[PDB]
Symmetry: C2
Subunit: 405 residues, 2 copies
């Protein structure tokens, strides 16, 4: 940076702290990643200056010829990545992407069927303190109490009982492949739309490592910043039949001016995802997660569902008589970043939990491989089996530093 250090020493010092923090820690928050310098440069461009309400070639402001090129690049590359008939790259976030789909097909008070939030469903899939649960009548399906795999007969029963207008599939903390074909079959049985929120798994889908929801779902929502490794924001994919309605839902429905610089950054990220090396990256993410899962099991940990098919895993800490809150805190002390996370049928509150959620997307981006996964698991074992030993924690600290260099 050249101008920020002089203009704003306070902001610059804090940004520098954050940059150094991102290098020093072992980042295992499953929703996080590290964007490329190209993505960041696009976000830091003069495109922030442009009002561009509307869509390419159909804007409500003059002078949009070039931001139109940028938005169309984003849309076309997204369609190439996911094989979708239509893309809307304007959503400000995952929240707004989901909000727009709900606004498109539902009226206030309509019934929606989503994944149980404490089994892996997201805030925007019906929390009573979120617009989703306040605006629409959410009901929930669960995972099997033993296998922790989505119970598709429960999806079906809930759908047949409650008769939702919309069914939502996908999750913030589900470690297995989701069967979109079965969701669509159930949706078809009850005459419901199917929305798939692929936010977490989007990069894996792009790389052919998770089944693609696009051919099965009426609407696919996603963030651009998780396994897709792009800037912070949202996106909607859908068939041409819903294109006009979806676009109108984003604008003039729920947003105003789009963030053209972020949209540029989206285009860049999609371009990166189209490359062969991104496919190799995504395979390493999944390979690393499986290796980490196996290594943690070797350390004596129980995993929700018994492992992972994707980028993330959930440790059930009940065998260790630890809460997720306790584990999160102590791991923070040694430089490992995880989230406390409810496990299916958790006896603890969401503020406490019996689990920790871990993902490999970020560490894989920084070049971690199988050997590093073994060591991460070993350090987690050392820490969680010796929470009261400051010497154990100091050893962990040194081993974490050894990994981040």
């Amino acid at each position: 940076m050249k101008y920020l250090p002089q203009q704003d020493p306070q902001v610059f010092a804090a940004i520098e702290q954050e940059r150094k923090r991102q290098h020093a820690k072992i980042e295992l928050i499953a929703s996080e990643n590290f964007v490329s310098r190209a993505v960041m440069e696009a976000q830091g461009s003069v495109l922030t200056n442009k009002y561009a309400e509307g869509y390419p070639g159909r804007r409500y402001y003059g002078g949009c010829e070039y931001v139109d090129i940028v938005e169309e690049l984003a849309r076309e590359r997204a369609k190439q990545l996911f094989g979708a008939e239509h893309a809307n790259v304007q959503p400000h976030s995952g929240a707004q992407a989901n909000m727009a789909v709900y606004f498109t097909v539902l009226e206030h008070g309509d019934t929606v069927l989503g994944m149980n939030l404490s089994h892996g469903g997201h805030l925007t899939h019906g929390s009573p303190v979120n617009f989703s649960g306040v605006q629409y009548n959410f009901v929930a399906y669960g995972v099997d109490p033993e296998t922790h795999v989505i119970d598709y007969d429960d999806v079906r029963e809930k759908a047949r009982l409650h008769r939702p207008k919309l069914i939502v599939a996908a999750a913030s903390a589900y470690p297995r492949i989701i069967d979109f074909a079965k969701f669509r079959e159930i949706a078809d049985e009850v005459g419901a739309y199917l929305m798939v929120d692929m936010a977490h798994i989007a990069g894996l889908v792009a790389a052919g490592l998770h089944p693609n929801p696009v051919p099965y779902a009426h609407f696919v929502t996603t963030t651009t910043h998780k396994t897709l490794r792009g800037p912070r924001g949202g996106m909607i994919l859908c068939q041409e039949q819903f294109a006009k309605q979806i676009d109108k839902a984003i604008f003039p429905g729920i947003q105003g001016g789009p963030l053209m610089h972020v949209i540029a950054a989206k285009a860049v990220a999609f371009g990166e995802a189209l490359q062969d090396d991104f496919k190799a990256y995504a395979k390493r993410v999944v390979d690393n997660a499986k290796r980490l899962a196996s290594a943690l099991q070797n350390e004596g940990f129980t995993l929700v569902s018994g492992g992972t098919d994707n980028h993330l895993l959930l440790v059930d800490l009940r065998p260790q008589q630890l809460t997720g809150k306790t584990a999160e805190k102590v791991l923070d002390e040694v430089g490992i970043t995880v989230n406390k996370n409810t496990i299916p049928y958790d006896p603890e509150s969401p503020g406490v939990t019996s689990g920790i959620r871990i993902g490999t997307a970020a560490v894989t981006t920084r070049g971690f491989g199988l050997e590093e996964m073994d060591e991460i698991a070993a350090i987690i074992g050392l820490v969680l089996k010796n929470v009261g030993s400051e010497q154990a924690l100091e050893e962990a600290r040194q081993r974490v530093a050894a990994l981040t260099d």
Copy 2:
């Protein structure tokens, strides 16, 4: 830029076109401005990588110590700028800032009283194709048919008749000072909350050139990217009594992860606005608008309300037998960027209009003064009085180029 040109030639070429366009044109879109290089660098930082749901010291993710510093800098500087008791710097946009306030105090179907959209009110102040008009029951007050000043007796009558839960003051196309004291008096009479959407005038308020709504309003919303000259995004100000509710409305209510890099950019912009030179800048904006108004009147143009108290003006093109659409198009041909805009009591549709909206914030940022305002008015006169003369348009083109260098 260093990495983008190599990684993504297509995106880079389009960004470069846009950068050059921003230099070449006379930018008179009233909602636009040019951010500093420091603001852009903050947006292009690694802060995009950080999930930070929640608030400073009260986050749902570990490792937020430094993004907390950044967000608190934004909040404290905003409070210093506007004298507000509380700031929420997380809203992704003006849309989301307004959305959150509505979510805080209203239930589905509640009556809200806002400015007539064709008299200057914004999309999010009750358009039937926007969430505001779909979710809540909007009624409207108007300006006087002759003076084009808000009719405060109409505000009062509408309030007493319809009994709104909330009154919204502020506008996207109102060239005069708004009397927030009168709005609060009316709000008090009917037991309604008062929200002021100061998006357009925020920089002028910060500079003491427009009365501050903060002491009169329960909630003040704004964008950060208009006269405030910051990054693209939203903000909410309110008294401490509503702080908790407002914060909960933004998260977990209507958003998820905030854009920490944009929040950094907000802090930077607020820091710039706190400086003496920003006050001088804002005075030049208002001085320039008054000069431009006078100069246009000298060219024979009629202005809505007969001039301006702020950064923007509205030309009533009926005396010239031109539509706003026609004027917008021909000015585009010569390198002057304006919006078609409905005038109060417009006989034309919103797709056609009888007016153009012009603002001086952007041209003032690039260093334009009073002499430049005279020349801009002269060029607009030359163009709009000679729409059928290609030689006149070519002369205009050359004079525009002369201004932008």
